[PDB]
């Protein structure tokens, strides 16, 4: 209450709903904390770390707007919810029910409120396509990161990407952390998901210089202190925002973790720069504050201005796979990769194999089809039936897996990487089999 | 088992309930 | 109308390639009929007798194989074209080796170079083969070193002119001519869904159907060597025939280009075309009488059917004897000369 | 009419696309070629439909799409691979008499890039191996041209060599490194260099095999 009055301060048409807001906050709190526990997932932690994320998300929603109705602030009130609580989820029930639960507290807590304007199915927020941090509809967004994917495919990686539902939610919730201050993020999910490319292609958009730890046969923690220098150096004295990302690859070892906690929490690792180090920080950070306007001199107000820098220039993004610390867990904002959904598969079939014929005008559509995908089109065309078949042959093999397991045989996991693999290898076969048959021709 | 791979998981779940069942559940100290 | 049936022969083709390679053969023929199922159930023309192995290889590249250490099955034939056809980096599971030695003879003329995970030059090793641009083929698999991730995804960063690979410490100069083949010698191994997406697997298990298959073909070609050659026909007719009899089309076009005089000087050329209308022919007769043929054939294999469960299970009887003792190790070559003494040397066949 | 107003926007088109073709190779920048590339796109698309009928802007159009579509090759071409010799196996394969110093946008512009992919692929795929083998080389002769021997006080007597295992270590490792180098594909320019190195290698690690015994005997012995 005390925080939401303080940020309610910038408003004064939203001061009487400083108030009640923090108590639909707190009630929402309380109901994740209760319904969720780390016994069905172990990232099921809930702390005032989050409810203090939550005010920080409305903050820097609301403070270079001039004015908001209160149908915006419950409309960015559920928006910050939604990426601080739902994200986490793993099954698609606790998802359901985390969105309903937002606006039954949204309504018990702000009666007389018009809930289609401070509620809309896709909540969704950025200043990509405007100056503001304000509500943007879902088409523009779309046609906004596909040109941005587009441009994407020239500069670093060449590798096609499909820009289905779950991908580009992905990408705004990446580009949220990355505008959040001291805003890390940590990618959970199945393997071949795509964390690793949206992390990358989510840095790259919004500017952020992506690095990462190289860790070698018998890493050194001076090693590991080496980096963090070099890291926070350029962050808060070179005022460069990077994107810090790790995989379990380095991960794993829980040594570098539990140090790379204090700068997730405080936004400063204390003892890092010392002796000659310490000198060139305090000379290097007196450069940086010159330069942008500050003509602080004391080192302890110097080391606050670059522990400032760190905090709103330095993000780290972690990836791993479903052992770690639940303070790590605390520290970073919790996001979930799924496997592709059935939509996802057809969205991927239907990109990827759109350089191919896959037409026959004459094609006879069967009565009673089955159908993988709910939404496809009905009547299908050939072309539809061809995506719909591939996307049964992956359920196939996940169905498979599963009969496999319950007989007790050993299974592999089918990662969306083996579809992607899967629609590579159709494209190949179909181009080669029909270049041999016209040359035969 | 390993002779032939296929029956036995029925098996095993009939004689480790019926283990189950003749084992008495707590001793008292 | 091979136009009208290469959509649903593609898609078959390259979902087995791509999924199965980890499954026995039961389950990778399970895995075939499902999707043959889904395409006919919605009118996706595709030919009713896939052989997989004839539509993703020819005569040539398996006569290659055969020269090479490549075992004359089913089951292996499938995981060479996998070997072939893949675009993650491969993962063997031999438990013999005959497939490591396969892939060191078809990669000898490109310098691959045998290492293996627990040895301690590894790395260095692997950044040469990274470096330099050669195949190389990494054994003990199942004590799996995470380095390799990024290059088993192929994550490369294209700083300055040079393409990069991060491994361990040290960014790599990623070679054009890179290929690295993972491998073990465990069947019963579990590895990382991770290690699972950035691998393909290729199994060479023997099995309970592989062997029972085996041992099936073994008897149709001692005891009934005509069913064998009209099966054998049967599989050399998705294709094999047609190459021969386009080979000799090119011929004849080739032969007819050179006329001019010498044409009439004879005017017995027409043999040639004889010659072909004959082939032509005899593989038309083939294409007529498939269906008969198959019927035949299969009512034979189902004559011999419990000769080959049976020769399954005495092997793996002979396998799982190791339990009683240390000293009943009994390799499945040992069964193999059982088997062949039994069909060929038995005197009381004579 | 209609017609000489499109004939008037079309040569002014090809006024702008001369512009861009006459800039020299080694200024053109990829990224802004394709920021004007797109800049030209949006100007052709801002035509009225009724002159976008014609079918010269269609040429045009479609020209600059090819273009944009090369663009990534321009990306792919403007490289510190290329060298002068991967650029004279381009001058050699594709049969056209360039001047690397007179080299513009606009001659490789001309030359079909789209109908040359496999060559323009194949020279590539040579630069980045022979790269690879080229800074390998350059990472022997500055690790062997600033690496120095730790020395260490012995009994105020005399500063024996201390690290051993990591001299040989380094030692080891670039010799079979080399010696993969002789197996790779793209060892053809790059071999003498690698054979004046080997034999440095050979004899570096030929005298520290006797130095390191010598000492260590000598150790035992004043011992
Ligand atoms: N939306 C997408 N469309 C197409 N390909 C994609 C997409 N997302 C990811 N990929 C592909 O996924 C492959 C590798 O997956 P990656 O992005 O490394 O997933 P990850 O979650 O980092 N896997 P891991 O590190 O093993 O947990 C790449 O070749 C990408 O091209
Ligand atoms: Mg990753």
């Given at each position: 209450g005390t925080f939401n009055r303080a940020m309610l301060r910038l408003i004064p048409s939203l001061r009487t709903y400083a108030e009640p807001l923090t108590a639909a906050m707190v009630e929402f709190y309380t109901m994740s904390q209760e319904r969720f526990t780390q016994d069905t997932q172990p990232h099921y932690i809930y702390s005032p770390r989050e409810m203090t994320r939550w005010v920080r998300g409305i903050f820097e929603a609301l403070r270079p707007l001039e004015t908001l109705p209160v149908e915006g602030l419950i409309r960015i009130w559920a928006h910050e919810a939604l990426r601080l609580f739902q994200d986490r989820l793993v099954e698609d029930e606790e998802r359901r029910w985390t969105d309903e639960n937002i606006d039954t507290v949204a309504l018990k807590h702000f009666p007389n409120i018009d809930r289609e304007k401070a509620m809309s199915r896709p909540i969704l927020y950025s200043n990509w396509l405007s100056k503001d941090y304000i509500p943007v509809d879902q088409?523009?967004l779309?046609?906004?990161?596909?040109?941005?994917?587009?441009?994407?495919?020239?500069?670093?990686?060449?590798?096609?990407?499909?820009?289905?539902?779950?991908?580009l939610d992905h990408v705004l919730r990446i580009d949220r952390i990355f505008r959040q201050p001291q805003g890390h993020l940590l990618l959970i999910?199945?393997?071949?998901?795509?964390?690793?490319?949206?992390?990358?292609?989510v840095?790259?958009?919004n500017?952020?210089?992506?690095?990462?730890?190289?860790?070698?046969?018998?890493?050194?923690?001076?090693?590991?202190?080496?980096?963090?220098?070099?890291?926070?150096?350029?962050?808060?004295?070179?005022?460069?925002k990077?994107?810090?990302?790790?995989?379990?690859?380095?991960?794993?070892?829980?040594?570098?973790?539990?140090?790379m906690n204090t700068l997730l929490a405080n936004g400063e690792?204390?003892?890092?720069?010392?002796?000659?180090?310490?000198?060139?920080?305090?000379?290097?950070?007196?450069?940086?504050?010159?330069?942008?306007?500050?003509?602080?001199?004391?080192?302890?107000?110097?080391?606050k201005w670059?522990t400032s820098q760190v905090i709103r220039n330095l993000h780290v993004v972690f990836?791993?796979?479903?052992?770690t610390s639940p303070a790590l867990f605390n520290r970073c904002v919790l996001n979930w990769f799924?496997?592709?959904?059935?939509?996802?598969?057809?969205?991927?079939?239907?990109?990827?194999?759109?350089?191919?014929?896959?037409?026959?005008?004459?094609?006879?559509?069967?009565?009673?089809?089955?159908?993988?995908?709910?939404?496809?089109?009905?009547?299908?065309?050939?072309?539809?039936?061809?995506?719909?078949?591939?996307?049964?042959?992956?359920?196939?093999?996940?169905?498979?897996?599963?009969?496999?397991?319950?007989?007790?045989?050993?299974?592999?996991?089918?990662?969306?990487?083996?579809?992607?693999?899967?629609?590579?290898?159709?494209?190949?076969?179909?181009?080669?089999?029909?270049?041999?048959?016209?040359?035969?021709? | 088992?390993?002779?032939?791979?296929?029956?036995?998981?029925?098996?095993?779940?009939?004689?480790?309930?019926?283990?189950?069942?003749?084992?008495?559940?707590?001793?008292?100290? | 109308?091979?136009?009208?049936?290469?959509?649903?022969?593609?898609?078959?083709?390259?979902?087995?390639?791509?999924?199965?390679?980890?499954?026995?053969?039961?389950?990778?023929?399970?895995?075939?009929?499902?999707?043959?199922?889904?395409?006919?159930?919605?009118?996706?023309?595709?030919?009713?007798?896939?052989?997989?192995?004839?539509?993703?290889?020819?005569?040539?590249?398996?006569?290659?194989?055969?020269?090479?250490?490549?075992?004359?099955?089913?089951?292996?034939?499938?995981?060479?074209?996998?070997?072939?056809?893949?675009?993650?980096?491969?993962?063997?599971?031999?438990?013999?080796?005959?497939?490591?030695?396969?892939?060191?003879?078809?990669?000898?003329?490109?310098?691959?170079?045998?290492?293996?995970?627990?040895?301690?030059?590894?790395?260095?090793?692997?950044?040469?083969?990274?470096?330099?641009?050669?195949?190389?083929?990494?054994?003990?698999?199942?004590?799996?070193?995470?380095?390799?991730?990024?290059?088993?995804?192929?994550?490369?960063?294209?700083?300055?002119?040079?393409?990069?690979?991060?491994?361990?410490?040290?960014?790599?100069?990623?070679?054009?001519?890179?290929?690295?083949?993972?491998?073990?010698?465990?069947?019963?191994?579990?590895?990382?869904?991770?290690?699972?997406?950035?691998?393909?697997?290729?199994?060479?298990?023997?099995?309970?159907?592989?062997?029972?298959?085996?041992?099936?073909?073994?008897?149709?070609?001692?005891?009934?060597?005509?069913?064998?050659?009209?099966?054998?026909?049967?599989?050399?007719?998705?294709?094999?025939?047609?190459?021969?009899?386009?080979?000799?089309?090119?011929?004849?076009?080739?032969?007819?280009?050179?006329?001019?005089?010498?044409?009439?000087?004879?005017?017995?050329?027409?043999?040639?075309?004889?010659?072909?209308?004959?082939?032509?022919?005899?593989?038309?007769?083939?294409?007529?009488?498939?269906?008969?043929?198959?019927?035949?054939?299969?009512?034979?294999?189902?004559?011999?059917?419990?000769?080959?469960?049976?020769?399954?299970?005495?092997?793996?009887?002979?396998?799982?004897?190791?339990?009683?003792?240390?000293?009943?190790?009994?390799?499945?070559?040992?069964?193999?000369?059982?088997?062949?003494?039994?069909?060929?040397?038995?005197?009381?066949?004579? | 009419?209609?017609?000489?107003?499109?004939?008037?926007?079309?040569?002014?088109?090809?006024?702008?696309?001369?512009?861009?073709?006459?800039?020299?190779?080694?200024?053109?920048?990829?990224?802004?070629?394709?920021?004007?590339?797109?800049?030209?796109?949006?100007?052709?698309?801002?035509?009225?439909?009724?002159?976008?009928?014609?079918?010269?802007?269609?040429?045009?159009?479609?020209?600059?799409?090819?273009?944009?579509?090369?663009?990534?090759?321009?990306?792919?071409?403007?490289?510190?691979?290329?060298?002068?010799?991967?650029?004279?196996?381009?001058?050699?394969?594709?049969?056209?008499?360039?001047?690397?110093?007179?080299?513009?946008?606009?001659?490789?512009?001309?030359?079909?890039?789209?109908?040359?992919?496999?060559?323009?692929?194949?020279?590539?795929?040579?630069?980045?191996?022979?790269?690879?083998?080229?800074?390998?080389?350059?990472?022997?002769?500055?690790?062997?041209?600033?690496?120095?021997?730790?020395?260490?006080?012995?009994?105020?007597?005399?500063?024996?060599?201390?690290?051993?295992?990591?001299?040989?270590?380094?030692?080891?490792?670039?010799?079979?490194?080399?010696?993969?180098?002789?197996?790779?594909?793209?060892?053809?320019?790059?071999?003498?260099?690698?054979?004046?190195?080997?034999?440095?290698?050979?004899?570096?690690?030929?005298?520290?095999?006797?130095?390191?015994?010598?000492?260590?005997?000598?150790?035992?012995?004043?011992?």
């Amino acid at each position: 209450g005390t925080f939401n009055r303080a940020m309610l301060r910038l408003i004064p048409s939203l001061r009487t709903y400083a108030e009640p807001l923090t108590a639909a906050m707190v009630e929402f709190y309380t109901m994740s904390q209760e319904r969720f526990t780390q016994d069905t997932q172990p990232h099921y932690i809930y702390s005032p770390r989050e409810m203090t994320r939550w005010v920080r998300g409305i903050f820097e929603a609301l403070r270079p707007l001039e004015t908001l109705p209160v149908e915006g602030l419950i409309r960015i009130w559920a928006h910050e919810a939604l990426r601080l609580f739902q994200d986490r989820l793993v099954e698609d029930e606790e998802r359901r029910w985390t969105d309903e639960n937002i606006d039954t507290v949204a309504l018990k807590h702000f009666p007389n409120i018009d809930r289609e304007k401070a509620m809309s199915r896709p909540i969704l927020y950025s200043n990509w396509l405007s100056k503001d941090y304000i509500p943007v509809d879902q088409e523009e967004l779309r046609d906004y990161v596909k040109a941005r994917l587009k441009v994407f495919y020239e500069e670093e990686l060449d590798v096609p990407l499909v820009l289905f539902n779950e991908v580009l939610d992905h990408v705004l919730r990446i580009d949220r952390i990355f505008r959040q201050p001291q805003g890390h993020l940590l990618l959970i999910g199945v393997s071949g998901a795509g964390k690793t490319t949206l992390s990358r292609f989510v840095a790259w958009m919004n500017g952020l210089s992506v690095y990462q730890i190289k860790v070698h046969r018998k890493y050194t923690g001076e090693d590991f202190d080496e980096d963090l220098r070099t890291v926070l150096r350029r962050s808060g004295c070179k005022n460069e925002k990077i994107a810090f990302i790790m995989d379990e690859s380095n991960v794993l070892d829980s040594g570098f973790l539990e140090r790379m906690n204090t700068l997730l929490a405080n936004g400063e690792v204390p003892g890092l720069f010392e002796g000659d180090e310490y000198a060139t920080l305090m000379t290097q950070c007196k450069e940086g504050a010159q330069k942008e306007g500050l003509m602080l001199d004391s080192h302890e107000e110097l080391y606050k201005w670059f522990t400032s820098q760190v905090i709103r220039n330095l993000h780290v993004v972690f990836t791993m796979n479903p052992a770690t610390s639940p303070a790590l867990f605390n520290r970073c904002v919790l996001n979930w990769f799924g496997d592709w959904s059935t939509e996802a598969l057809y969205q991927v079939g239907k990109e990827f194999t759109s350089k191919m014929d896959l037409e026959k005008p004459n094609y006879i559509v069967p009565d009673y089809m089955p159908v993988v995908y709910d939404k496809l089109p009905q009547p299908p065309s050939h072309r539809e039936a061809i995506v719909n078949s591939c996307v049964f042959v992956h359920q196939t093999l996940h169905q498979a897996n599963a009969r496999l397991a319950k007989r007790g045989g050993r299974t592999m996991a089918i990662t969306p990487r083996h579809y992607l693999d899967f629609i590579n290898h159709y494209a190949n076969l179909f181009h080669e089999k029909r270049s041999e048959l016209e040359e035969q021709q | 088992m390993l002779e032939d791979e296929d029956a036995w998981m029925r098996t095993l779940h009939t004689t480790a309930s019926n283990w189950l069942h003749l084992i008495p559940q707590t001793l008292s100290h | 109308n091979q136009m009208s049936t290469i959509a649903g022969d593609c898609l078959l083709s390259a979902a087995f390639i791509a999924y199965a390679g980890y499954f026995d053969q039961q389950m990778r023929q399970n895995l075939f009929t499902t999707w043959s199922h889904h395409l006919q159930q919605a009118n996706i023309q595709f030919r009713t007798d896939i052989a997989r192995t004839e539509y993703l290889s020819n005569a040539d590249e398996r006569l290659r194989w055969q020269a090479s250490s490549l075992p004359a099955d089913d089951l292996c034939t499938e995981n060479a074209i996998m070997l072939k056809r893949f675009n993650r980096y491969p993962l063997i599971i031999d438990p013999s080796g005959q497939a490591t030695e396969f892939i060191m003879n078809e990669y000898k003329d490109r310098k691959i170079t045998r290492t293996s995970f627990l040895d301690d030059a590894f790395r260095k090793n692997l950044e040469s083969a990274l470096r330099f641009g050669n195949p190389l083929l990494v054994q003990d698999v199942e004590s799996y070193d995470p380095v390799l991730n990024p290059v088993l995804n192929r994550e490369v960063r294209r700083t300055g002119g040079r393409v990069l690979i991060t491994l361990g410490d040290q960014d790599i100069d990623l070679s054009p001519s890179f290929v690295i083949f993972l491998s073990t010698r465990d069947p019963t191994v579990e590895f990382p869904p991770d290690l699972c997406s950035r691998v393909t697997f290729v199994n060479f298990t023997v099995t309970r159907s592989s062997l029972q298959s085996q041992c099936l073909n073994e008897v149709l070609k001692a005891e009934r060597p005509d069913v064998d050659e009209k099966r054998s026909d049967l599989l050399k007719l998705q294709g094999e025939f047609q190459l021969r009899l386009r080979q000799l089309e090119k011929s004849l076009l080739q032969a007819l280009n050179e006329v001019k005089g010498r044409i009439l000087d004879d005017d017995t050329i027409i043999t040639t075309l004889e010659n072909l209308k004959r082939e032509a022919a005899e593989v038309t007769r083939k294409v007529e009488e498939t269906d008969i043929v198959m019927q035949e054939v299969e009512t034979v294999s189902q004559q011999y059917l419990p000769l080959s469960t049976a020769c399954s299970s005495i092997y793996f009887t002979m396998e799982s004897l190791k339990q009683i003792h240390f000293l009943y190790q009994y390799s499945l070559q040992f069964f193999l000369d059982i088997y062949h003494n039994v069909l060929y040397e038995n005197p009381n066949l004579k | 009419q209609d017609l000489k107003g499109v004939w008037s926007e079309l040569s002014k088109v090809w006024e702008q696309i001369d512009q861009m073709k006459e800039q020299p190779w080694v200024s053109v920048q990829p990224r802004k070629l394709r920021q004007n590339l797109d800049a030209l796109l949006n100007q052709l698309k801002s035509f009225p439909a009724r002159l976008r009928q014609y079918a010269s802007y269609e040429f045009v159009q479609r020209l600059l799409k090819g273009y944009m579509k090369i663009n990534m090759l321009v990306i792919e071409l403007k490289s510190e691979a290329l060298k002068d010799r991967h650029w004279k196996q381009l001058m050699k394969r594709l049969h056209v008499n360039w001047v690397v110093s007179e080299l513009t946008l606009g001659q490789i512009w001309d030359v079909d890039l789209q109908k040359n992919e496999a060559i323009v692929k194949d020279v590539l795929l040579v630069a980045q191996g022979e790269m690879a083998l080229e800074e390998f080389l350059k990472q022997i002769r500055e690790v062997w041209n600033t690496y120095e021997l730790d020395l260490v006080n012995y009994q105020n007597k005399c500063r024996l060599i201390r690290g051993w295992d990591d001299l040989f270590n380094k030692v080891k490792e670039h010799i079979n490194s080399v010696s993969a180098m002789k197996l790779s594909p793209y060892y053809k320019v790059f071999e003498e260099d690698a054979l004046s190195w080997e034999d440095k290698l050979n004899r570096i690690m030929a005298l520290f095999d006797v130095w390191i015994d010598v000492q260590r005997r000598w150790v035992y012995l004043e011992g």
